[PDB]
Amino acid sequence: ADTQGYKWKQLLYNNVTPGSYNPDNMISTAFAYDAEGEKLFLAVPRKLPRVPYTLAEVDTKNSLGVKGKHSPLLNKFSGHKTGKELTSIYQPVIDDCRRLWVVDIGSVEYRSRGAKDYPSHRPAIVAYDLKQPNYPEVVRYYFPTRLVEKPTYFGGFAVDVANPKGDCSETFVYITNFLRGALFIYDHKKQDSWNVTHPTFKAERPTKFDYGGKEYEFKAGIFGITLGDRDSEGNRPAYYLAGSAIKVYSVNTKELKQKGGKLNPELLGNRGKYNDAIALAYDPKTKVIFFAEANTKQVSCWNTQKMPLRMKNTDVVYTSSRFVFGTDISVDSKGGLWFMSNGFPPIRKSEKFKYDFPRYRLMRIMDTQEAIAGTACDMNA
């Protein structure tokens, strides 16, 4: 229930000329905490003019629980020199072997105002090794032209490592796209990729979002994906949900890994009306799935083991009237639960939304177990 974290009115950068960018256009959509290295990584997509670094880092060490250090300045990615090595990213993910993955969208989303500075190129999956310094590039795969399907609408993704205690090369990556309702699959070992769709990936009802005492809507497909417990032989459930939905599914990673295979996703079933979330993460320690929600101002949980899924079998692990639009959530290496809001949902003009309290909220609960305590999510029951 107790949290430690950061709050930002604006995302200011360290070592960048004051006035050279508008702090209000710096909008971050996702994060990733490397618990061992004590670094926080933020995606700030190049969605508006003059974003200096699209992958920014902050050293959490003398910051985290300390009074007065609630708003750290963003720094250029230590693995970077100019901050052009990446065009625009929406989401960073840290795998089981401390590789930091991102999906470079390949283009900025505004015209003029300096768009020439960040030349266009095909989208790319890129990864960096945090275990070395300073963070060398270890994967860089460009998308083939006949597979590009609206890259601007990629959401969360999952990194499936089949051999964590070897060279970590038998690796799959599955990337949500919430416009269409598609999932991009990448075989790192084979250097091939393909595209998958399913009626299950599509939205249910448009999502109600409240801003300025008025009610807005959006309708989003498959938006987050999170990986379950590995069986005898490598495979696992991959739970996904759509932004504009209250149902949750698990397809098996073995059906997924098979190029042009058939898919049989399991409904399981739902979370109660109005609890649309865009982000979810599976905790291996407690077997809970945490959900960072759009309009409910809350983070909720469901124990995977308490089959079947309905509201009665879910509880709430965080409430704050200032938790406007949850946009990311994940578990760290040391079992810390991390959740983010930004008051930036996929609605026209939403970049221009503003709040009396700080817009950007990153909170960590110390342990998933302390989180689920008194709740319908905990072992005892």
CA atoms of 291 and 279, how far apart (whole Å)? 6
Within 63-151, residue ranges assigned H as helices are none
Experiment used for this model = X-ray
Which domains are delineated in the chain? 1-381 (2.120.10.30)
Q: How many residues does the chain have?
A: 381
The DSSP secondary-structure symbol of 264 reads: -
Residue type (1 letter), 25: N
- Number of C-alpha atoms within 13 angstroms, CB side, residue 310? 2
In this structure, which long-range contacts are made by residues 256-260, counting pairs with CB atoms below 8 Å and at least 24 apart in sequence?
256/172, 256/174, 256/183, 256/185, 256/196, 257/172, 257/185, 257/187, 259/185, 259/187, 259/192, 259/194, 260/194
Tokens of 224: 């987050």
Residue 342 in marked binding region:
yes
Instruction: Determine whether 171 is exposed, middle or buried from the number of CB atoms within 10 Å of its CB (0-12, 13-18, 19+).
Output: buried
CA atoms of 317 and 340, how far apart (whole Å)? 14
CA atoms of 378 and 362, how far apart (whole Å)? 24
Instruction: Identify whether the C-beta of residue 293 lies closer than 8 Å to the C-beta of residue 320.
Output: no
Q: Which residue has the tokens 């393909």?
A: 194
Strand partners, 76: 56
CA atoms of 40 and 45, how far apart (whole Å)? 16
User: How many helices, marked H, and strands, marked E, lie in the chain?
Assistant: 2, 26
CA atoms of 330 and 339, how far apart (whole Å)? 7
CA atoms of 346 and 90, how far apart (whole Å)? 13
The C-alpha angle with vertex 45 and arms to 35 and 251, in degrees rounded to 5, equals 65
CA atoms of 2 and 336, how far apart (whole Å)? 12
Q: Which residue has the tokens 């004590």?
A: 38
Residue type (1 letter), 217: E
SS3 70: coil
Tokens of 75: 């720094």
| CB contact set of 190 (below 8 Å; sequence gap of 6+) | none
CA atoms of 381 and 354, how far apart (whole Å)? 42
Q: 10 Å Cβ neighbour count for 268?
A: 17
Instruction: Identify whether the C-beta of residue 96 lies closer than 8 Å to the C-beta of residue 53.
Output: no
Residue 344 in marked binding region:
yes
CA atoms of 293 and 367, how far apart (whole Å)? 20
CA atoms of 101 and 171, how far apart (whole Å)? 12
Q: What is the dihedral of CA 178, 180, 186, 192, to 10 degrees?
A: -160
CA atoms of 52 and 46, how far apart (whole Å)? 9
Phi then psi for residue 131, to 5 deg, are -75, -35
Beta-strand pair 137-142/154-161: unpaired
Q: Which residues of 194-233 are buried (b: 16+ CB within 10 A; e: fewer)?
A: ebbbbebbbbeeebebebeeeebebbbbbbbbbbbebeee
Instruction: Identify whether the C-beta of residue 267 lies closer than 8 Å to the C-beta of residue 249.
Output: yes
